[PDB]
Write a protein that binds this ligand. Structure first.
Ligand SMILES: [Mg+2]
Ligand SMILES: [Mg+2]
Ligand SMILES: [Mg+2]
Ligand SMILES: [Mg+2]
Ligand SMILES: [Mg+2]
Lengths: 127, 240, 163, 229, 121
RNA sequence: UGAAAUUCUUGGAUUUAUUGAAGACUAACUACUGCGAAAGCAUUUGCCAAGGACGUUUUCAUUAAUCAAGAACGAAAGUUAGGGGAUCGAAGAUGAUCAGAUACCGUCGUAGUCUUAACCAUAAACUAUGCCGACUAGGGAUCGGGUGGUGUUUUUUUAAUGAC
């Protein structure tokens, strides 16, 4: 009676992607981003944008028939920060508030055993 | 998940009530007083439109309700409700006794089309997306037999019984590819059919009008087409 | 030793069903169908206890239960700049400052909390608050002396009060 | 940004009218696990209806936690990859494709003041299944230890790594893929590693970190139906 | 017995406490910067004076009056003075601090238990 | 990005999943630890020779310390001639040129970053501290080796080793 999905959330510095899919992950059920629910580029990464996108995806999720999901949060990873930012947290909260049962939470950020050089250079970046 | 009853003449929302789960299937009896609600949780809610209270709450289906058919007549006690879920399960609920009278499983895919007609004994026409049509015969007793299974070549979005000019029983099936066709129950052959549009489209439903004289073919592209089958049925041409 | 002040808010206000498992050394929170009412309480409780798990004072962690728009920002020093040996060790000292004064300077101005878990930094506040804090701490990493940062911290503080 | 003030983009010129709901033509498909796993039901998936649906089903890989399949939270940190191979009446017959641990679990095990031993072996089963195993071990301190750390001399890690190598290769060579998976669930391999490596050095948190499937043999549906019973 | 486990338990703490107190030293030992060390020395004397007889003083002057160690005839002080090198203020302060400290020495029918520590709470 | 535009994108971008290919590089373990004359050195296994310390009731018998001349190595950058060219990236162009905490940002990116065979020989190449030898306080942490105990664990037959 309980059908499970996978809510893949990607929280970047400049935007948050909320994606729900089948257990295999190949079928997309609904994809909504921070830019979807906002007017200004500066507010794409805002938690408020994430909450609206989460609410949007949740409505479609119920519409299709999926009632539970397994959340796989991740960040940019690679040569950049590994921890999901506030936006993914807000989206994760929104899904819980949406009423969809949350199956399992995991962090699947790309962690490189070895990585190429970063964009900043020797003197750094992120002034 | 809020049912709202709106009165056209009065033009205000007479009744508002809450349902257990989202419901995408709504059926109103021909007598225009009862409404059956098919939720994705398998629960069936029957509401009196004029009064606005729950009359029946049938919870037997496991899958999502995909089709609901009210059977009844004015000044009769043989009132029945037929419900089909997405699991190919069909149940004939009896309103007067408030119980499930029959259970059918031969369908494998979702059941989208239901129709009961009285045999001068009652006949049920069940059609689903599995591209088959099943004709059942049954009564108030523990009798429910399958008569025929028609491979209709088309995904059955909606189906029902139709009467010819001479009185011959006919079955109308509107489905995928945006085609509406008519099949004799006995022969099983398609008498008449509509031309398939070049654009891929589906008939999401059919709306009987004027004692089944003309039907509105609702298409997935939000376009309604009116066909007068009774005149077309008289026409010898096999194209509607 | 702080558990006496942890379960009361969750079990009573949030109406959650709490337990900590010695065998796996983890905390357990379960929603009670007959008692729990808020759908978001369970995740909120999880959000709260994590904050303590990152190194946060309990009372600060309670703010996450009381409010809903408090988030955790996290990053490492190496993400900013690849400092090593003494360079890394000094850079940590810059952020804390003498007697930890610098860390308190940012926290008051920005209305957040900071834990300097070696090279790991975590920030709690409103989204606007944490982002500006990210700027101040990072500016220290790049080599800015704290005294100059202190002046900027004062500047942003006034803007916060006016609005 | 969806806003009006957002500057217009080229891609807005050529656009198809949204007239068909894909889910209408999507047909749900039920997924079943091999008989090795206690809970065979592992959910369902959807694909476009055949115009075929079968081709997209083949090669379909799904990852799922062992706890759901075995109904025990002892496997909460373990995930199993299943690939769809045969389809019958909406039932998707799947076979073992891989195994791995949750990231949070791994990061938990890695800790300060101890030595990490990572051994990997590329070996083939009796069923001509080439696979690569990754095993992780952690040094521990004795009950009456008093030193803060329990680092091990490089000769031990080489000795520990060797002993892990034979057992991993030994088990894979003398078993089929299905039998190997039967070993993974109770983790008898981990207990075997502990006993053999016990004398050399005290170890903790011994696990088979990951399993990879490099090459597959020629497909045999007869070998598949027996696995599903 | 089980008390051996306890005995191990204290010994681990002592070593780990020693390791921490150790850990703070070489990092501090490596920081030799006169501004930093001067600040540390300044506050140390203030704490010394607040928290923590003439015979010792006479002996202290007695050594100072014979050795003559704290005037500008010393190797370091003579080296700075003769070369126009103490005219810079910072080194003059050190030279003057030396003289005062030397000067100081020379001074004289009816109708018919923890909840939830280990169990679910 | 503080805020944006060049820029890619309905021939489908980004995102999802099963793979494959190219070139670097060995995260987390990583520590007030180890090895090397220094510069430097972190995946698995094999071959090659090399090395400190320890043990020795084994051997040669002053063969030694320092070192102008002379010789080997020598961070990164750089030069010559091939290979390779994933990432980054001096130089350079170009989007934007509004706002001082976020005020130097983005896209493209040559030489270079890698490797083969050769050149240069400079650093806060720091312990701002020559090398060799003797002597001059207590304490316990760590690394390698050795010695001792009728100490714990393990060998789940003992044991002996291994770890404490
Ligand atoms: Mg080592
Ligand atoms: Mg050395
Ligand atoms: Mg070249
Ligand atoms: Mg150096
Ligand atoms: Mg000496």
């Amino acid at each position: 009676s309980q059908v499970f999905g996978v809510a893949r959330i990607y929280a970047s510095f400049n935007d948050t992607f909320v994606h729900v899919t089948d257990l295999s992950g190949k079928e997309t059920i609904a994809r909504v981003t921070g830019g979807m629910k906002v007017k200004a580029d500066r507010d794409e990464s805002s938690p408020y944008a994430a909450m609206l996108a989460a609410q949007d995806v949740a409505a479609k999720c119920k519409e299709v028939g999926i009632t539970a999901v397994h959340v796989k949060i991740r960040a940019t990873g690679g040569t950049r920060t590994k921890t999901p930012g506030p936006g993914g947290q807000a989206a994760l909260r929104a899904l819980a508030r949406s009423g969809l049962r949350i199956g399992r939470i995991e962090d699947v950020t790309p962690v490189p055993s070895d990585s190429t050089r970063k964009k900043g250079g020797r003197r750094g970046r992120r002034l | 998940q809020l049912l709202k009853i709106f009165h056209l003449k009065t033009g205000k929302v007479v009744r508002s009530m809450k349902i257990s789960s989202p419901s995408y299937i709504l059926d109103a009896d021909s007598t225009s007083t009862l409404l059956a609600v098919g939720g994705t949780d398998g629960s069936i809610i029957v509401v009196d439109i004029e009064n606005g209270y729950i009359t029946h709450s049938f919870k037997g289906h496991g899958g999502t309700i995909s089709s609901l058919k009210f059977y009844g007549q004015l000044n009769s006690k043989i009132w029945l409700l037929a419900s089909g879920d997405t699991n190919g399960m069909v149940k004939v609920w009896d309103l007067v006794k408030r119980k499930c009278l029959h259970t059918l499983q031969e369908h494998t895919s979702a059941v989208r089309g239901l129709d009961i007609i009285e045999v001068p004994s009652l006949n049920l026409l069940s059609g689903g997306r599995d591209d088959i049509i099943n004709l059942w015969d049954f009564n108030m007793k523990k009798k429910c037999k399958l008569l025929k299974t028609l491979p209709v070549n088309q995904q059955v979005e909606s189906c029902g019984f139709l009467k010819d000019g001479d009185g011959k029983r006919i079955i109308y099936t509107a489905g995928g590819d945006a085609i509406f066709q008519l099949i004799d129950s006995e022969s099983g052959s398609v008498l008449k059919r509509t031309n398939k549009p070049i654009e891929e489209l589906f008939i999401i439903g059919v709306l009987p009008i004027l004692s089944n004289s003309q039907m509105f073919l609702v298409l997935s592209d939000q376009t309604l087409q009116l066909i007068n089958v009774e005149e077309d049925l008289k026409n010898d041409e096999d194209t509607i | 030793n702080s558990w006496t002040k942890i379960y009361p808010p969750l079990v009573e206000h949030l109406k959650l069903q709490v337990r900590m498992n010695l065998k796996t050394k983890s905390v357990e929170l379960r929603t009670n169908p007959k008692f729990t009412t808020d759908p978001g309480a369970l995740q909120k409780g999880a959000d709260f206890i994590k904050a303590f798990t990152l190194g946060f004072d309990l009372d600060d962690s309670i703010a996450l239960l009381r409010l809903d728009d408090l988030y955790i920002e996290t990053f490492e020093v190496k993400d900013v700049k690849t400092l090593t040996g003494d360079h890394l060790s000094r850079a940590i000292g810059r952020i804390a400052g003498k007697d930890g004064k610098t860390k308190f300077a940012i926290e008051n101005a920005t209305r957040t909390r900071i834990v300097l878990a070696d090279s790991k930094i975590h920030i709690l506040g409103g989204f606007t608050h944490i982002r500006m804090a990210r700027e101040s701490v990072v500016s220290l990493i790049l080599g800015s002396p704290p005294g100059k940062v202190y002046g900027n911290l004062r500047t942003v503080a006034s803007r916060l009060k006016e609005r | 940004a969806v806003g009006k003030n957002k500057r217009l983009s080229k891609g807005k010129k050529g656009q198809k009218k949204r007239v068909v709901d894909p889910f209408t033509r999507k047909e749900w498909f039920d997924i079943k696990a091999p008989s090795t796993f206690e809970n065979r039901n592992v959910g369902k998936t959807l694909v476009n209806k055949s115009t075929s649906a079968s081709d997209a089903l083949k090669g379909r890989v799904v990852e799922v936690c062992l706890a759901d399949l075995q109904g025990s939270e002892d496997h909460s940190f373990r995930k199993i990859k299943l690939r769809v191979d045969e389809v019958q009446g909406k039932n998707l017959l799947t076979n073992f494709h891989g195994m791995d641990f949750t990231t949070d679990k791994l990061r938990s095990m890695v800790r300060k003041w101890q030595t990490l031993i990572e051994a990997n072996v590329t070996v083939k089963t009796s069923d001509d299944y080439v696979l690569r195993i990754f095993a992780i071990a952690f040094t521990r301190k004795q009950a009456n230890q008093v030193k803060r750390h329990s680092y091990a001399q490089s000769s031990h890690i080489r000795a520990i790594r060797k002993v892990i190598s034979e057992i991993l290769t030994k088990e894979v060579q003398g078993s089929t893929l299905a039998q190997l998976t039967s070993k993974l669930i109770p983790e008898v391999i981990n207990k075997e590693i502990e006993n053999a490596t016990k004398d050399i050095f005290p170890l903790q948190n011994i696990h088979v970190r990951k399993v990879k499937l490099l090459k597959q043999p020629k497909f045999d549906v007869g070998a598949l139906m027996a696995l599903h019973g | 017995p089980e008390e051996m486990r306890k005995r191990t338990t204290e010994m681990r703490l002592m070593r780990e406490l020693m390791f921490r107190e150790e850990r703070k030293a070489r990092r501090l030992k490596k920081i030799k910067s006169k501004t930093y060390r001067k600040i540390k020395k300044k506050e140390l004397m203030k704490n010394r004076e607040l928290a923590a007889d003439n015979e010792d003083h006479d002996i202290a002057r007695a050594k100072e009056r014979m050795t003559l160690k704290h005037k500008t005839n010393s190797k370091w002080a003579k080296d700075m003075i003769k070369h126009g090198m103490t005219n810079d203020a910072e080194t003059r302060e050190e030279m003057e601090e030396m003289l005062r400290q030397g000067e100081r020495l020379k001074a004289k029918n009816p109708w018919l238990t923890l909840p939830g520590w280990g169990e679910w709470a």
